[PDB]
Ligand binder design. Sequence first.
Ligand SMILES: CCCCCCCCCO[C@@H]1O[C@H](CO)[C@@H](O)[C@H](O)[C@H]1O
Ligand SMILES: CCCCCCCCCO[C@@H]1O[C@H](CO)[C@@H](O)[C@H](O)[C@H]1O
Ligand SMILES: [Cl-]
Length: 448
Amino acid sequence: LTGRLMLAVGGAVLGSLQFGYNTGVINAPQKVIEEFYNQTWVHRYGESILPTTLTTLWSLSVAIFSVGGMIGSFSVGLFVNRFGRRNSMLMMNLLAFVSAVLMGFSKLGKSFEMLILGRFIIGVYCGLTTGFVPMYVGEVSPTALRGALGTLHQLGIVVGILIAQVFGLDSIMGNKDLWPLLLSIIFIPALLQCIVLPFCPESPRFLLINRNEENRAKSVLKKLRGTADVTHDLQEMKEESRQMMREKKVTILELFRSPAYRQPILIAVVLQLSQQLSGINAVFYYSTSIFEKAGVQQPVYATIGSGIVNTAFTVVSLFVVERAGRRTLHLIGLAGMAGCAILMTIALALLEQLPWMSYLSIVAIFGFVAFFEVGPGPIPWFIVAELFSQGPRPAAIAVAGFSNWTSNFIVGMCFQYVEQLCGPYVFIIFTVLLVLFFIFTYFKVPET
Ligand SMILES: CCCCCCCCCO[C@@H]1O[C@H](CO)[C@@H](O)[C@H](O)[C@H]1O
Ligand SMILES: CCCCCCCCCO[C@@H]1O[C@H](CO)[C@@H](O)[C@H](O)[C@H]1O
Ligand SMILES: [Cl-]
C-alpha cells in the first residue's frame, strides 16, 4: 500500500526466507556432506565411518536445528517485549552470521561439530524469527491488509525452501567444493536485513502499548499510513488494548492445571503433532535420499519439483482456507497424505519388479506435499488461535510451537533409523499416524 509499508514488510519477511532456506537446504547435499563427514572421520581415526554412526551424526545435523527452534520460539516473548519487534529482528542477525561462519568454515576446520553447532544456532534464530515476523507484519500493517500481508510469512518459508533446493543441484553449490557456501550464503539475506531494518519503522502497537509513547506511535503511523488522519488506527490499537486488558494472561502452568483449559490445549497439541508426525519433513529433509532409493532419474530435480508443488499449494491454500471449514480441510489433508503415503509404499515395494515405479514415487511425494499445504500445514494454527481468547492465547501458541518443534525433532532425528529398518514400509508408519490423527480430528476436534 504505502511504500514505506512495503519496505517494512519486505525487510521483515527476509527472515521468512531465512526460515525456509535453512529448513530444506540440508536435503540435496546430504551425500556430499556425508562424504565430508566420512572424509573427516578417516582423517581423525584412520578408519571409515560406520554406516549407523554416519546415520546418527547426519540425523543429528538435521535434527539439532529443531532443538534450537524450540528454544528460540520459547524465548520470543523475552526479546519482543523488551527490545521491540524491529530491534529484535535486527539484533538476531548476529545468530545468522555466527551460524553462516560455523557452517561455512566447517570444511576448512574439518569439523562436523562446527556444522552441527551452526545448525543448532541457526535453529534458535529461526524459532525466534517465526514469532517476530508475524507480530511485526501484523502490527505494522493496516487492519484491512494485515490478513493478506500475514501470508507473506509462510510464503517466504516455502519460497525459501524452493531456493535452497534449487541451490542444491550439483550444477551450483550442491557439490563437493561449494556446499559450505550453500550453507553459509544465508549471510546475504542477513546482511541485507541489517541494512534495511534501521530504516524500517518500529511497531506502532509496540510504541503505543509496551512503551507508552502515543505521539511516537502516531508519528510512525503517519509514515506507515500516508494520510494524516490516523486516529482510526490509534483508536483500534487502543480498542484492541482495552480488549486485551479485559483478560488476565494465562501462564503455561495455569493452562495445564485448569480443567477449563486441559481439553482445548489437547486439541491444539495433537494438531501440531499431526502436522509434523505426518512425516512432511521426511520429504523436505530427505526427499533426495529417498528418491535415490526409489531409483528416480535425478533425485535433486524431483526434490525441486516437490518444492515447486509446495509453493504452488501454499499459494493455493491461501485462497481456500477462508472458503471452507478448518475441520473439513484438515481431514481432507490427512486423508490425502495417507493415500499418498500408501502409493509411496506400493511404489517402493514394487520398484524391483517395475522400474517405472520411480515415477510413482515422484507423484506420491508431490501429492503428499500438496495435501499437506491444504490441511495439516496451516490449520493447526487456525484452531489454536480460535480455541483461545486473548487471555490464554499467547501461552497456547507457545505450547503449540513447542509441540511442533518437538515432533519435528522426532521425525528429523529418527526417520533414517526407521528407514534402514522398515525399508519400503516406512511410509506406512506415517499412514498409521495419519489415520490415528484422522480419527482424533473426527471425534475430538471441534469446528471453529
Ligand atoms: C546493532 C545491534 C542491534 C541494535 C538494536 C538496539 C538499538 C538501540 C536503540 O534503539 C532505539 O533507541 C532510541 C533512543 O532511545 C529510540 O528512540 C528508538 O525507538 C529505539 O529503536
Ligand atoms: C503467521 C502464519 C501462520 C500460518 C502458517 C501456515 C503455514 C505453515 C507451513 O508449515 C511448515 O511447512 C514446511 C514445509 O512447507 C515445514 O517444513 C515446516 O515444518 C512447517 O511448519
Ligand atoms: Cl518495534
